[PDB]
Design an enzyme around this catalytic site. Sequence first.
Site, short mmCIF file in Angstrom:
data_model
loop_
_atom_site.label_atom_id
_atom_site.label_comp_id
_atom_site.label_asym_id
_atom_site.label_seq_id
_atom_site.Cartn_x
_atom_site.Cartn_y
_atom_site.Cartn_z
N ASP A 289 2.45 -10.44 -1.94
CA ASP A 289 1.37 -10.15 -1.02
C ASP A 289 0.49 -9.07 -1.67
O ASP A 289 0.77 -8.58 -2.77
CB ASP A 289 1.90 -9.75 0.35
N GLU A 495 -4.22 -6.42 13.52
CA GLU A 495 -3.38 -5.14 13.49
C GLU A 495 -3.10 -4.57 12.06
O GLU A 495 -2.02 -4.01 11.80
CB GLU A 495 -1.99 -5.21 14.25
C1 LIG Z 1 -6.72 -4.06 4.84
O1 LIG Z 1 -6.79 -4.63 3.53
C2 LIG Z 1 -7.08 -6.01 3.57
O2 LIG Z 1 -5.88 -6.71 3.81
C3 LIG Z 1 -6.03 -8.15 3.92
C4 LIG Z 1 -4.69 -8.75 4.37
S1 LIG Z 1 -3.32 -8.26 3.35
C5 LIG Z 1 -2.71 -9.76 2.67
O3 LIG Z 1 -3.81 -10.40 2.04
C6 LIG Z 1 -3.47 -11.65 1.46
C7 LIG Z 1 -4.60 -12.11 0.52
O4 LIG Z 1 -5.81 -12.14 1.27
C8 LIG Z 1 -3.16 -12.64 2.60
O5 LIG Z 1 -2.87 -13.94 2.10
C9 LIG Z 1 -1.91 -12.13 3.34
O6 LIG Z 1 -1.55 -13.03 4.44
C10 LIG Z 1 -2.09 -10.69 3.76
O7 LIG Z 1 -0.86 -10.10 4.26
C11 LIG Z 1 -6.59 -8.69 2.61
O8 LIG Z 1 -6.92 -10.08 2.69
C12 LIG Z 1 -7.86 -7.91 2.24
O9 LIG Z 1 -8.28 -8.33 0.95
C13 LIG Z 1 -7.65 -6.40 2.21
O10 LIG Z 1 -8.91 -5.73 2.01
#
Ligand SMILES: CO[C@@H]1O[C@H](CS[C@@H]2O[C@H](CO)[C@@H](O)[C@H](O)[C@H]2O)[C@@H](O)[C@H](O)[C@H]1O
Length: 606
Positions: A289, A495
Amino acid sequence: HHAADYVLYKDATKPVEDRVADLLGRMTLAEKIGQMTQIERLVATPDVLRDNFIGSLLSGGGSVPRKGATAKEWQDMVDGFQKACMSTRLGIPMIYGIDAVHGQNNVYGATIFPHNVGLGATRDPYLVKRIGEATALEVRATGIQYAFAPCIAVCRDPRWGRCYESYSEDRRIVQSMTELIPGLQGDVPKDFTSGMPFVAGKNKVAACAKHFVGDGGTVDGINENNTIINREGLMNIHMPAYKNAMDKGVSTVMISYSSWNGVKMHANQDLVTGYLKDTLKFKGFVISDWEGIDRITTPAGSDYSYSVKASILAGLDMIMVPNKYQQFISILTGHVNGGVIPMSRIDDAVTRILRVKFTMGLFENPYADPAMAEQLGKQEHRDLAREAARKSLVLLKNGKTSTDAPLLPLPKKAPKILVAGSHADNLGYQCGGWTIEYQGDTGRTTVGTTILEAVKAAVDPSTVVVFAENPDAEFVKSGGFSYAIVAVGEHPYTETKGDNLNLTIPEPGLSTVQAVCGGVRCATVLISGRPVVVQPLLAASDALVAAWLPGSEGQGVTDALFGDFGFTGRLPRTWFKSVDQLPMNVGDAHYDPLFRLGYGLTTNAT
Ligand SMILES: CO[C@@H]1O[C@H](CS[C@@H]2O[C@H](CO)[C@@H](O)[C@H](O)[C@H]2O)[C@@H](O)[C@H](O)[C@H]1O
Ligand SMILES: *[C@@H]1O[C@H](CO)[C@@H](O)[C@H](O)[C@H]1NC(C)=O
């Protein structure tokens, strides 16, 4: 097989495993570690991609070439990055990933499907397969080859800010909805070996079962947090749908930020290597992740050398860095040069990454197809989203007493009707999180039809439609309305930030329902990512519909309200009486729901 300058890995007629082996055997350590590195488009340039032999890029939530970008702008961006990767010595194409989790949702003008909780309410796996098929086309319209979906979390506590990304608290429903996978990727052949990766070709995308494992079990729904449960419960609730994903050839698996009984998933060799790879026989690639390896330590990022060692030894193959690629590559290179990480581990990671890339045809079609651009927001896909939205609706009440005339379905012909509420004419609110921005947004953020627009499109031409966002009681009583449709609910969230453990909808919402319903018969449409405190809304309303987060096609809501189709959705989650009860799951002990899993009233089409 034939020209003096023949290179077996570049021969499209050769078996995937032979191509993988032939390419692997030629690679330098820098080339290998490069494949294991995924970076944000925000930090990518041609030189970075070439010089570091980069394996993958992503758009995180909201990471776009510009607001309002066309499909062709996206294709040109992805192709620009690909040209750089194809110019390396070995010409290994990059794979580009994105969260296309309810349609190609970062992209302006993409069809936005209902979120997973509403899809769970449909109990219609073939519908979800078709949504996967449509989504793959819209992702390929933008030149992207890899979707970070499905989320197969089994959300066991609706306080979790991602509960809307879970099809159900019941693992059996989540298992059924793994049909998204062969939608996105294509159906696997008849003689298929469970755990092998599969993508049919250039009109499909690699999928990602996420987040492994127990992301839906975090104490008090915390997220990023700890899943406290014995092996039996992990294996009985949180794991099963990963096996269905293996059987359907899911190409990749993304690891959870969460821990299982205090062990970080990103450092859990027993589960990642011992179980996923060695027991389930997963042969695709395992991806971290976002800064997932950083979060192995407390504080996060405080010992990145350890993060790299722990995650790569645990069995992760590709690291979503996503920004500090120089540090990642340098540290991993040092660990290999020092014997801390054996070359066998690097070769396994790269074997898996290459296996997915060759299997999916990426070496044969590394570039975008301009003829696919018109798939974005295509009306057939919107018709499918509209069907899905309508099927997702759960009718919770249709009459204040057992002897009242049922309010729904509403007549399309009436002298004057009222449409009200904060969610009646707000496309961003009806889509929720992961739409255009990571956390979603308010207002007209993309192409779609709000509930108000849907109403105006449905009613007889003689029906006067009045909109008032937050009318007072007097306005309603004086208006000469036949009935009202009032839409309220949650604001968009993920969240990371959204939040409110109290699970009550923001005001004005209840106050508006009370003012409206006090003056005229009312159908309340509740927009939410989850069950929320609902008794006061029910008390005030003649009829109430849980519409979840229905996406861009608001006419799905009106198709049911006006009787073009009957209500058929059934709760995919328990509706609690109060948040004090949580966690509380179909099966517990103190199981005392307001509405049980499977509850849903019906209507017949008029
Ligand atoms: C708050 O920072 C932001 O977080 C999001 C979600 S974290 C992570 O991101 C992966 C790739 O996009 C997702 O596939 C996964 O389900 C999530 O847990 C992130 O997308 C932003 O880029 C970031 O700024
Ligand atoms: C709906 O369909 C079934 C019979 O097919 C029945 O429950 C009900 O009487 C029908 N009509 C209405 C308006 O409920």
